[PDB]
Amino acid sequence: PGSMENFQKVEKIGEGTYGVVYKARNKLTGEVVALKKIRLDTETEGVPSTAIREISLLKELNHPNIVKLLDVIHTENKLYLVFEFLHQDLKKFMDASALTGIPLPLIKSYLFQLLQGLAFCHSHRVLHRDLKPQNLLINTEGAIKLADFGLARAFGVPVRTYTHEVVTLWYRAPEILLGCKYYSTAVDIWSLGCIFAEMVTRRALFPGDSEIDQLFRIFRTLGTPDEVVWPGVTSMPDYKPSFPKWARQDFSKVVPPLDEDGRSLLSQMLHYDPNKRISAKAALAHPFFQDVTKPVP
Template sequence: MDKGESLFCTAGKIQSGFSSEPILYSGRNPVRKSSPAPLLHGGKCWGQGGPGHLWLSPPRWLEGPGCGSGCHLSSVPSLQDVSKRLSLPMDIRLPPEFLQKLQMESPELPKPLSRMSRRASLSDIGFGKLETYVKLDKLGEGTYATVFKGRSKLTENLVALKEIRLEHEEGAPCTAIREVSLLKNLKHANIVTLHDIIHTERSLTLVFEYLDNDLKQYLENCGNLMSVHNVKIFMFQLLRGLAYCHGRKILHRDLKPQNLLINERGELKLADFGLARAKSVPTKTYSNEVVTLWYRPPDVLLGSTEYSTPIDMWGVGCIHYEMVTGRPMFPGSTVKEELHLIFRLLGTPTEDTWPGITSNEEFKAYNFTHYRAQPLINHAPRLDSEGIDLLTNLLLYRAKGRISAEAALQHPYFKSLGERVHLLPDSKCRLSPPKKGQNKGSWCLQVPLCSLRGAPAAGWGGSL
C-alpha cells in the first residue's frame, strides 16, 4: 500500500458507525447516494467503489495488505483500534504540487482599506457634488431642463435629478432661482422635498425626492376611473399642500395633474414650482402667461395681471372634476376656445355673476354667444351634493369669491375622513389603509387607500 492508500484507509477507520454495513461516501452526506464528489490526492482518486467513491467502514482495521477488494469488515472495535485512532498525526501533509495548484486557483482577497484611503474615497461624494448621484433613467425633458431618475451614493435612495442647462443663459434661469429659493423654505408632507443643489459651469441640478408617478399617469393606469373615495383623499392632500403655500404668501401658478406627484403609498405632493411666486401684496401685477391653458382661470385668460391665491383655486376645481370624471374639464387649444368651453358649461358671465366683465375689452371683442349655466351634477354624476357644492365654489367667475384652500379643507365634503385629519402635523400626510374586506387585486399602483373601483371598505375609519 502506498502512502496515499494508507492515508485514506486510516481516514476511513476513524468514522464511527452503528451498522456493520459499509456506507457509500460521495463527498456530501454519507447516508445519501448523491452525486459523487471525488477526493483527490496528488491528482488521484482513491476508493473501493470506483473513481470518486470511498467505502467508509466502522472503526476497525481492514485485514490484508491494503484497501482493495479483499478487505474484511468487523463490527466490533478493539482497544488497538481506539489507540491507533487517537494517535493519528495532527499535521497531515499534502503534496507540494497540490498546494501550489490550490494557491493558483484561489482568488486574492481584497486588502482592507486604510483609514486614509477610506477618508479619500468618502471625500469624493457629499452634498453639493455631482459625483454623489448616479443617473439611472431619463424621465422627461422640458424647455430648459431635463429630469432623470437617479440614486444617491450617500443614502442609496432613489432621487429625481432636475438638470437645468446654463449654456444659453447668463447664470441660472430665473425660474430655477425662483424654484430653489421657494422650496428651501417649504417643508411639508404634501410638497416635494428638495434634498440638494449642485451648481457647475454647465448646469444647475436640483435633487428632489423621487416619486413613482404623477396624477396624470395615475389616472391613465386606473383606466381614468378612480374611486370617489380616493378622489376625496387626493383632494384633501392637494388642499393641504396648497394651504401651506398660501399661508406663506406663495402662489403655485401652474397646478395641473402632471405637477402633482404620487408615490406607492398614496401620498400626493405638489411639485414644479418654476412658475411660483412669493407675493407681498395681493394686488401685485404679474404676467398673465402662466398656468397651463386647461387649468387657467377666465380672469387670467382675459388678460388680468392682478391676482392672488384664487388663481390656484380655479385649477384645483378643474383637477377635482378631472379626477371624478376621468377627462379634462376645459381642454381648449386656444384662449378663445378655452373661454368658449368655460362659458358653455358655466354660463356666459354677466354683471351679476362677474361684476365689471361687460367693460372688459377682450371680453367684448370676442362677442361670445350667451349661454345658460348647466347643472354640474349632469357632468359629474359621481359626486355627491357636498362634492358638487365644493366644485361650484372653486369655479366662481369672481376671483375673490372663490373658496380658499384653508376654507376648503373644512368643507363638509371631507367630513367622512374624520376629525383627526385636521390635527395632522405638517410632516405627515399618509392615510391609513382599510382594515377589512378590501379587494387588493383592484388597487391601482397598489395604493393602500381603498378599492379604486368600488366603495370604501367596511371598517375603514378614515384616519391618517
C-alpha cells in the first residue's frame, strides 16, 4: 500500500539489533509512524533471517500490547517496516524516573500489560527472546507494548533445541546460562521478572559482566540451586560442582518497596525450575493484579 515518497523523516530514533528506526510522518494523512529501515544484502546473503522472522511473526500477532506493524514497503535495496509510533522506550523512561521512581500503580499497570502481550505471544507459539526495557515501548496514554521481534521465533510443541545465543545478558534465564538443551516460554517470563524488579528498585536486578558473573549474581540473590529446588540442575551441561553455595536472600531485601503479593509474584517469575516458573497466563490471575488500574505516565 505504501511507497516512500509520502513519508517525511522527522528524526532518527537510532540503531538497534538490526535496521534503523526513524520517526516519520505521512504527508498526506498526517499520521506519525515509526519506520524501521532494513538493508538487504542484495549482494549477497539476501533478506536477513531476523527480518524474515520479525515480519512473519508480527503480522500474525495482533494485540494492543504488541507493537502494530502497519505496512511493509519493498524495494530491491531496502525494506521499510511501518509501525505505529510510540514515543518512548521503557529504558529511557526508567532513566527519566530515576530521581522520583516509577509509581507502584504504573509499575503494576505496565507489568500487567506486558504479561497480556506475552501470553498472547506464547498462545500463538512465539518466543520473544529479547525482553528488556529498551524493547518495550510506551505511549502518552499509559500503554506499553512489546517490540523488536528480530530475535523471536515460532516454537513447536514440544520444543526442540533452539539458538543458544539468546537474550541480553542481564535478562537471561539460568537455564540458558547453564547451556540447557531445551528452553521455552519460561525464558521470557524470567526476563519480565527482571524487568519488574528493575522498575521497583530503579537498577538492574542482575547486572552481570560475563556469563559466569551473571550466574553468580543470580545465585547470590536467589541462592545456589540444588536438585531439591530444581530437579535436573546438576545434569545441565554448564553446571559445575565447584559453584559456590550461597544462601537465598530474604525477598524484603531483594525488593524492599514491594507488598507481600508483589514479592509472591516476583518469586514465581524467578523460580529456577522452568517447569514451575509461572506462565504469563497464570500471572495475570495473580492477586497482585486484583486492583490493577491504568495510570497515565
